[PDB]
Amino acid sequence: TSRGERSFDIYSRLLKERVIFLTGQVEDHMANLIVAQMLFLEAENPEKDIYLYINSPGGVITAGMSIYDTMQFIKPDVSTICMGQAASMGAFLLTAGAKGKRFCLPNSRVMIHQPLGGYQGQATDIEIHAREILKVKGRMNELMALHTGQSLEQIERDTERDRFLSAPEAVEYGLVDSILTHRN
Amino acid sequence: MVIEQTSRGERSFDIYSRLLKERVIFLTGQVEDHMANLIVAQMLFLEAENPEKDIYLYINSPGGVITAGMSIYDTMQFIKPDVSTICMGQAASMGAFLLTAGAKGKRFCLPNSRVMIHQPLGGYQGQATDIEIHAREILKVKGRMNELMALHTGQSLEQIERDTERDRFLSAPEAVEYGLVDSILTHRN
Amino acid sequence: LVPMVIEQTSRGERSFDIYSRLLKERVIFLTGQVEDHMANLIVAQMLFLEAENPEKDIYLYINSPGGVITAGMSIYDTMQFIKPDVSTICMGQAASMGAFLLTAGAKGKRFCLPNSRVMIHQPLGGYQGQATDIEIHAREILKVKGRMNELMALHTGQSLEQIERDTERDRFLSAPEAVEYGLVDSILTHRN
Amino acid sequence: ALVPMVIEQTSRGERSFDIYSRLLKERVIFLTGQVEDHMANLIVAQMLFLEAENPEKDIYLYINSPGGVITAGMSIYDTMQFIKPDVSTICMGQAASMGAFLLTAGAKGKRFCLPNSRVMIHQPLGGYQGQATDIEIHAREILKVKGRMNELMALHTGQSLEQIERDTERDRFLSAPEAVEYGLVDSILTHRN
Amino acid sequence: TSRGERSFDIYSRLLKERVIFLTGQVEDHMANLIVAQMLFLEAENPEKDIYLYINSPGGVITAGMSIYDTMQFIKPDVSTICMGQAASMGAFLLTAGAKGKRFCLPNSRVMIHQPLGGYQGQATDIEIHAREILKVKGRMNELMALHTGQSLEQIERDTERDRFLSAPEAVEYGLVDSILTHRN
Amino acid sequence: EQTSRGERSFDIYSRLLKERVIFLTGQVEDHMANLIVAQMLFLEAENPEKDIYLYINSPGGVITAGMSIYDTMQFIKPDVSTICMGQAASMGAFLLTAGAKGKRFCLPNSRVMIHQPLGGYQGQATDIEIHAREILKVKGRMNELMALHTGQSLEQIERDTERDRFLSAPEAVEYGLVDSILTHRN
Amino acid sequence: ALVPMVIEQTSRGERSFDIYSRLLKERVIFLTGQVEDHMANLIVAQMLFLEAENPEKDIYLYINSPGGVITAGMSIYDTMQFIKPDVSTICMGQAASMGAFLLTAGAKGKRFCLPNSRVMIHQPLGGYQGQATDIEIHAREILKVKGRMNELMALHTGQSLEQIERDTERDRFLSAPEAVEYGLVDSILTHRN
Amino acid sequence: ALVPMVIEQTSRGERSFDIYSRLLKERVIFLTGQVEDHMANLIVAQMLFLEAENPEKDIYLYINSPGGVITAGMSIYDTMQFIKPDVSTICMGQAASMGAFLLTAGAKGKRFCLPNSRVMIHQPLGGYQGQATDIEIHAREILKVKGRMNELMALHTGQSLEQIERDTERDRFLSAPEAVEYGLVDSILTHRN
Amino acid sequence: SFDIYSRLLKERVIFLTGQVEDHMANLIVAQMLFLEAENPEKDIYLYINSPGGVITAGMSIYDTMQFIKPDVSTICMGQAASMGAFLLTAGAKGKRFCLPNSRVMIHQPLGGYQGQATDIEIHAREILKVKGRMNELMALHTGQSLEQIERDTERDRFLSAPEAVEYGLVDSILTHRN
Amino acid sequence: RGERSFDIYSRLLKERVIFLTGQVEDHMANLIVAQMLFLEAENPEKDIYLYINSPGGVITAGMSIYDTMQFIKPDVSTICMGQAASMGAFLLTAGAKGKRFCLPNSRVMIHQPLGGYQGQATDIEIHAREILKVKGRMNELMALHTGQSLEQIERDTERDRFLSAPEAVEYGLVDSILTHRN
């Protein structure tokens, strides 16, 4: 079950330490739980850093954006740490952490790519939804350019097709600031 | 395995073969690749038996796949004989399109038949870059179809575009008045 | 479509199913639910018999629970269009679109067998989508309903008002009641 | 193993001869399995073909059925009474519900049961779903169908309408000898003679 | 979902600070839960504002209206905040918040359109139901005009087909009052 | 919104039950109906004189399950005030109109729908008659009860319920289904 | 079947043909629907038959297909080039992927598009599952197939290898007049001469 | 309907043959799709028929297959070597696994590949579930099957057994020219004489 | 009051049981981070009984084991196959054990993909990179040469408890409580 | 249906009683291992009682229980109720010498390992060789615990073999039968 004579379940005990976990595919409900944890911690102490551990293959864009906007809105800096993998929306939330406080573990990996979608209906409605996903794609490429330091042209260039990055390559690309190897 | 129902005469010769000798072809049900190829084959055959006599295409359809219907359209336009079209029951979407594509002066509607017109339907799934290529393509198809409908009915392109944004039904007399068909058939002479 | 009827091989003609053999007697069967393909087959048989001989009567036997309206209308219009009179006979039941096709037969040539039953009612339908489109389709089924009531009044001799009134909910009629109502001309009992 | 073909001896001329088509030439029609619209239509068509071939000679209808749809069965019943030829009925295996009704509807004096056949009679079955107003309209009709079937059964068997009503409230089985005594059939067929 | 973070009432904790979350598809039971939380907060203090966070693709209209009427009925002002997305009934409830207290986060999006439905039965019954959904459509356009300040004719025009709005466009249209970017 | 407890040992619904508020949400069926009856018997016990508030958002459901709620509403000492939010259709509308006279309300944008009983059965003709006859008796009792609570005549109710009929909040007040509309607290 | 039969007159059993078999007699072959092993084998058989009937007269192949399996399509490609007769190709409706490849593989100067037909081209699709070592062997192979297909498209259209590769990385649609200009087909067919 | 036909009923010598029966008259047999017992039996029957009609003339076997059941394929292999006629093999599309084995088993000097056909070779695949004792029995049998197939492949290709064993541990593709240098086929067919 | 697993966590014992996947792996990482904060010096004991699973999920556990201050002692009971065997050998040198009748199995990565040839090449390249990395780390922890690890992992290979010690996969066998 | 007094099983655990019920697999096996490690820490000198009613299951899962039983300090007494088949019969005979019991009407069943694989011939060989090594090790452990010769165990387990409580005592699978509360 995981409790330990220290608090309640194990995740609640680590939250006391200002640690939050983002695990698995991103969708509305698990995202709302992360938003709630961030707001709670800000109310507890708006000055202390918050740590967000990420191991995810990605997921729903609007759900991921509810997390991104919350991270930027709250007072505390949100430090991000990639373990296992950070793909697509996971890679986006990883690079969105506070500058100088984004990390990768030695054997983790990152993968980036463009938005995926679909629709069915009248030609007039298809045009409406196609234009919208193109706008979403442009905004995501711009936010990626701003957080990594890369040129808008390079981002577009690099997201057309899936692209994998090792921990050292992610530091050089500007996705994260450094690699964590041994405590202290 | 497939041989069933329609089969009266040595389990091969049917009623439809009988009428084909008289130059009559039936387009029934949803439009798709295999039923469409069958109609094309029948047109090429009749043209070969006699390139001067008319061919009659009866239509009772809810529509279907656009590329398959365009194989029939182009064949109707390519061959030598005139193709007379007759609507019975209903002629909707790709079905209304093929009805109005018949030989000018030889397009008919029976008294209580109905016609329905509208715009193309589609759907795609994949990367944003590919969604753009496919959405662009269906928009070109929509424009092409609107231009051909303008040519066959005599209406202006702008009028066709406004009337096909959403489903529009037409009674037999309304279809004559709109230029979809030439006249109504009521009682054989 | 199974029994291959032929002579005792005493030098005759080709082989043909039971239904094709009755088609030489100018008889056509309308059986089961009305739908596009079974309807198209009936139309082809009517056109064939008109070409064979434009003057002789055609007989249409009906045993159906009803079906798709546009498919039934392709049959109705063909019946009124061809030269020959189409006589109709109800065996088993004639419901909804089946009752409609039964009353549409040539005047004085519409019959019911003794224990047959007829049922009449209004159009059934359904749609799903945006409010604007729901409106377009609801308006259309109201027109369809109006035209159907108008044709029924014309063939039964009944007033439109009476037809509208009696088709709101299902209504059953025995053979005798169908004669009184004007749906059929008389009842067939023994070969005559 | 599907449909036996027999073309020899009594032929010389044309081919194509299924087992059932050959027996039709001898005026024999088979009614087998559940009664419903399409199989019933096939039986009606055969009766009409045989009347056209010869309006005076008897037709033989073999019956082995658990019953089925009432309207479909009435299409056969009315056709049997309408055509000119007498329709002799013969039960083999079983004739239940609508099957038993068609057996008893055969020409008087020409209705038979094979020795070990079984007959069963009961009342109509049905079901509906909808608003209370529509439920009363359909319940009322099935009660009328019930009354008409009991009246026709009384007429063909010679039993009083009261007795038919009491005997069909629940399922009732009859052996071949009991079917003759009840008036459902005229006699038992044992050996060809 | 995420397998761990709430555990010991993360949502009940935030309710104590008068915060309520409306997430995912709108339907009867999730809506009744939002209504109960609003009635509870009013009783605790009929004077203090309540904050309703919204991340929803829309849902059942009658369910959404139970939330709308409750929002207007209680004494306390209800502030609305869109995160991720607010589409259809989600967009409607976002615009229904208290005047001057409706917000959008920077990268959230809104989508508006007309009602959707479907029926099957006798022509007489089809007419009855078609008439009711057209009346529902008329009423919703009238409430959207009221809350946005746009003319009824402009609302009818813009809702015939799906229409997307970025955060800045939602402010300009009158759907929300402003955009929240950074705490302070 | 997900709220495991408007306290810690009390969920959101238990807390409001302390303020004498009960919620009837979704389809009406045996188990949810029994839960409502229990809450009513419990509240009566706590204080037989104070009013009970029943909020209703329902598409309707099983008739016998609904009548267990109706009969309990009339049997207990306290008056049961009814409030429609969202929609009250079929049996939902019936229970709304069954509240204490003068204390039946509709929120501004809620809607009501009324109609006749729906049913179904399968079997022998003798049994079909037995069940058809029963659903007809049920229909007549329901029409007689709607007349009593609304004030309309039996004849009028019978005509208005043959087919589905929708009423907006204002029309429900004129028809007599509810007493008035609620818009803003005090 | 739903296929019409061809017969001259009722001269007591004259001729019994099939619409498709009748047109095969005139050297016309139809390639319809998705491309796979069995439908492809049938096309190969009709071609081998036609060449055996007369090694000099042209063969006409009508194409309306969304494409399909590469190896199956290649069996048709190699057969078209191997036989003596020139194989004229005509696109009606659409010719996508493998369908487009086979349309352009027809005899130079004898490849046509009807006025409103459409063509679509792209690159090979595939997939595998297993150990890393085997994954390498299979990825390596689809890339060699990709390279070969591109070289053949370049030979039949006249476009440079570079242009083909560029134009096929992603789906690319072409109208009839645009296919003529690209070199995919030779000209359009509007009205019978 | 589906399969085309040629030569209908005519004066005296009627005989109506389908597309495949027609090519059989010219001693051509098609092997397509996955190899399994029933399709394999059909091929064996066609080979015995052709041997009976004329034991001295060559038979042509066209192959387009991804492979299949080994015992089914071996019934074809043993019949090929037993009958008196030489069996010429031609690969179109692909010849993988058992399909590649039957291709190389053709008469020496009479085995061909079309220009863009593809070949793939590998070791046997299998499975089993049961008691350890029975697992040993079945495991031993598939290893014996593996050895016998490698020995026969060495015999027909000319390669050493050691080379065959090393090249089949994992999937291995060969283009048509590589199949020739390997000894799998004798030459490439490009254009008809 | 307290379930059996929470009681053992009090003693610094963590269990890795069944297939390796994201959520169960996250639960393991959280337990390690909790134990480290309670005492960054004391050893942690990780029992393993697993057939393997998702590589990225397993690598989140591996990186955490190395990162934290305390030594992580590993004990194989039942079996440790594939990713399970990898995590067993990744334990602190001198503190890796096997029970007498446990079994170990090693092999190369497994994967799969579906799509356009261009994307297929991108994914095939990445799994070959993963294979090289894993082989490098196995060599480091076992003491065997890279070429030797490459040869022994091309196809499934089983090792009894004694063979795992001889191979350098674990340090010793535990038989009876000292 | 289940759960009495909120953990009747926790209460019995306080008396050093553990139950092994139903199919043997990874998760249920791990719970048994955890209970044994817990009791050893509570008191390493007192006996532990393991009740067994099982049709058998996964071998590697059962072996984790087997090795823990031998590793810990306390003696583990085993008691069969209902049935002990396959891996269940194995864990029963593995208890402390002199402390293995059968209730009067319980029954035991022994047999050889079962398995299955699918793939290339080379891989089939690797896996078939491994299950044969497993079969040999299991027969050697059964011979050590029962006192029977290895050859007798190999012969008796080729096919399913059932034993009543008294036959299990004679075979050396258990030490005695428990009939009435001592």
Please give the C-alpha separations between residue C44 and each of B17, B20, E41, G29, H1, in angstroms, as whole numbers: 10, 11, 73, 29, 21
Are A21 and E2 within 8 A, CB to CB? yes
Give the separation between CA H105 and CA H58, rounded to whole angstroms.
14
CB C92 within 8 A of CB C63: yes
Rounded to 5 degrees, what angle do the CA atoms G50, G51, G57 make?
A: 85
B125 touches chain A (CB under 8 A): yes
Residue type, C53: N
Give the separation between CA C69 and CA E183, rounded to whole angstroms.
64
Give the separation between CA B47 and CA F127, rounded to whole angstroms.
66
Which is nearest to I117 in space by CA: H94, G149, G119?
Answer: G149
E182 touches chain I (CB under 8 A): no
Are I155 and J122 within 8 A, CB to CB? yes
D137 touches chain F (CB under 8 A): no
Instruction: Give the resolution value in Å.
Output: 1.9
Place of tokens 């009328």: D144
At C29, which helix (H) or strand (E)?
strand C27-31
Give the separation between CA J161 and CA J151, rounded to whole angstroms.
16
Please give the C-alpha separations between residue F64 and each of F70, F92, F137, in angstroms, as whole numbers: 10, 13, 13
Choose the mutation target among J120, J123, J132 for the interface with H, i.e. most H CBs under 10 Å. Answer: J120
Active site residue D171: yes
Chain-centroid distance of CA I81 in Å reads: 9
Q: Which residues are G18's β-sheet partners?
A: G5
Using CB atoms, pick whichever of A11, A62, A72 lies closest to residue E5: A11
Rounded to 10°, the helix C131-156/C69-81 angle is 40
Give the CA-trace dihedral at C125, C130, C135, C136, to 10 degrees: -80
Give the separation between CA H31 and CA H34, rounded to whole angstroms.
9
With contacts defined as CB-CB under 8 Å, which chain F residues touch D167? none
Q: What is the DSSP letter of G115?
A: T
Catalytic residues of B: 93, 118, 167
Using CB atoms, pick whichever of A55, A106, A109 lies closest to residue I22: A55
Which is nearest to J40 in space by CA: J1, J75, J87, J79?
Answer: J75
Active site residue G186: no
Give the separation between CA A114 and CA A93, rounded to whole angstroms.
15
Chain-centroid distance of CA G169 in Å reads: 21
Cβ within 8 Å of residue C154, ≥6 positions away? none
Which is nearest to D125 in space by CA: D35, D15, D25, D24?
Answer: D35
Instruction: Establish whether chain C is in contact with chain D, requiring a minimum of 3 CB pairs below 8 angstroms.
Output: yes
Catalytic residues of E: 88, 113, 162
Active site residue J160: yes
CB E179 within 8 A of CB E171: yes
CB C64 within 8 A of CB C117: no
Give the separation between CA G180 and CA G118, rounded to whole angstroms.
11
With contacts defined as CB-CB under 8 Å, which chain F residues touch E28? 25-26, 57, 86
Choose the mutation target among D10, D82, D145 for the interface with C, i.e. most C CBs under 10 Å. Answer: D82
**Active-site residue among C20, C74, C121, C185?**
C121
Give the separation between CA H124 and CA H146, rounded to whole angstroms.
6
| β-bridge pairing G28-32 and G59-65 | parallel
| β-bridge pairing D87-96 and D118-121 | parallel
Rounded to 10°, the helix E28-44/E61-73 angle is 10
Choose the mutation target among E61, E114, E126, E159 for the interface with C, i.e. most C CBs under 10 Å. Answer: E126
With contacts defined as CB-CB under 8 Å, which chain B residues touch H2? 2
Place of tokens 């209705």: D111
Q: What are phi and psi of B100, to 5 degrees?
A: -75, -10
Cβ–Cβ pairs < 8 A, chains A and E: 109
In chain B, the domains with their CATH numbers are: 1-189 (3.90.226.10)
Indicate which technique resolved this structure: X-ray
- What distance in Å separates residue E54's CA from the closest CA in chain A? 10
Task: Tell me what percent of chain E is helix, strand and coil, each rounded to the nearest 5.
Answer: 45, 25, 30
Please give the C-alpha separations between residue F89 and each of E68, H80, H81, I147, in angstroms, as whole numbers: 19, 78, 81, 76
Q: What are phi and psi of A56, to 5 degrees?
A: -150, 145
Please give the C-alpha separations between residue D180 and each of D64, D107, D112, D173, E135, in angstroms, as whole numbers: 18, 15, 9, 13, 70
Give the separation between CA C5 and CA D18, rounded to whole angstroms.
9
Q: Catalogue the E-assigned strands of I29-178.
A: 44-50, 72-81, 96-98, 103-106, 110-116, 157-160, 172-173
Report J:52-71 residues touching H (Cβ under 8 A): none
With contacts defined as CB-CB under 8 Å, which chain C residues touch B18? 44, 48
Catalytic residues of I: 82, 107, 156
For chain G, the residue count is: 193
Q: Which residues are C86's β-sheet partners?
A: C58
Give the separation between CA I73 and CA I92, rounded to whole angstroms.
6
Chain-centroid distance of CA G103 in Å reads: 5
User: C35-47 burial string, b = 16+ CB within 10 Å, else e?
Assistant: ebebbbbbbbbbb
In terms of Cβ atoms closer than 10 Å to its own Cβ (0-12, 13-18, 19+), residue J105 is exposed
CB J102 within 8 A of CB J159: no
Secondary structure (H, E, C), chain H: CCCCEECCCCCCCCCCEEHHHHHHCCCEEEEECCECHHHHHHHHHHHHHHHHHCCCCCEEEEEEECCECHHHHHHHHHHHHHCCCCEEEEEEEEEECHHHHHHHCCCCCCEEECCCCEEEECCCEEEEEEEHHHHHHHHHHHHHHHHHHHHHHHHHHCCCHHHHHHHCCCCEEEEHHHHHHHCCCCEECCCCC
Are A128 and E164 within 8 A, CB to CB? yes
Give the separation between CA E13 and CA A175, rounded to whole angstroms.
35
User: A42-77 burial string, b = 16+ CB within 10 Å, else e?
Assistant: beeeeeeebbbbbbbbbbbbbbbbbbbbbbebbebb
In terms of Cβ atoms closer than 10 Å to its own Cβ (0-12, 13-18, 19+), residue B34 is exposed
- What are the tokens at G21? 């078999």
- Nearest residue of chain H to residue J118 (CA atoms): H127
Using CB atoms, pick whichever of G123, G128, G145 lies closest to residue I118: G123
Q: What are phi and psi of J89, to 5 degrees?
A: -70, -35
- What distance in Å separates residue G95's CA from the closest CA in chain I? 19
